[PDB]
Design a protein around this ligand. Structure first.
Ligand SMILES: CC(C)[C@H](NC(=O)N(C)Cc1ccccn1)C(=O)N[C@@H](Cc1ccccc1)[C@H](O)[C@@H](O)[C@H](CC1CCCCC1)NC(=O)[C@@H](NC(=O)N(C)Cc1ccccn1)C(C)C
Lengths: 99, 99
């Protein structure tokens, strides 16, 4: 679908058998989700943002279904104020910017 | 133009008579630029993001030309790690997400 930006570009995703709303974020290199229950091994990692850095858990090869499109990639889980779908997954669902 | 997301969606903008490169960021409500010289009155504001918050100067009714498209709006200036063009301006240049 085509999405205008008068409102936050939120979509529904299913990951780890759970449903969540996430922001389609072209400015983010990575995908980071709020604290949630995911299975498997993970490594410690630090990512930066507008106000500094936060520590998160890195899960690789995680399956995510974004607005009906499946994608597998790295997902970070930590103290983010909102669920963000970054470019590593946006490219997989064929998301583009147009103007 | 149409922009895929395998690389950061950077565009050239002209603001305050200066040329800068900025990120088309669908996840940002606001537009924030690294410290720069802008004329006029401004109001101290506080914005948040990953990592916490930063203090910025708020300039309203600022003329900005993004990749050839003119737009007038609020622009925040402060210790941001990168120039961000948020939805407040993306809507003005008719930018949409597609997938
Ligand atoms: C998630 C992070 C992994 C990501 N960091 C990176 O990708 N980096 C460091 C590599 C890099 C380097 C250079 C250029 C691009 N990328 C990030 O935080 N990306 C934000 C943009 C950014 C990029 C680089 C430095 C600083 C900032 C992200 O893409 C923005 O869209 C971000 C999303 C926001 C949503 C919920 C609250 C935390 C994260 N927007 C902002 O930080 C923005 N904040 C808001 O818009 N807020 C707080 C309102 C809001 C609430 C809820 C939903 C949407 N907006 C600031 C005013 C700039």
């Amino acid at each position: 679908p085509q999405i205008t930006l008068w409102q936050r570009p939120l979509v529904t995703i299913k990951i780890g058998g759970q449903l969540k709303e996430a922001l389609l974020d072209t400015g983010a290199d990575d995908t980071v989700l709020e604290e949630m229950s995911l299975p498997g091994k993970w490594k410690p990692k630090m990512i930066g943002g507008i106000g500094g850095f936060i520590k998160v858990r890195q899960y690789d090869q995680i399956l995510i279904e974004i607005c009906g499109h499946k994608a597998i990639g790295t997902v970070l889980v930590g103290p983010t104020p909102a669920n963000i779908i970054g470019r590593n997954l946006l490219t997989q669902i064929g998301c583009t910017l147009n103007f």
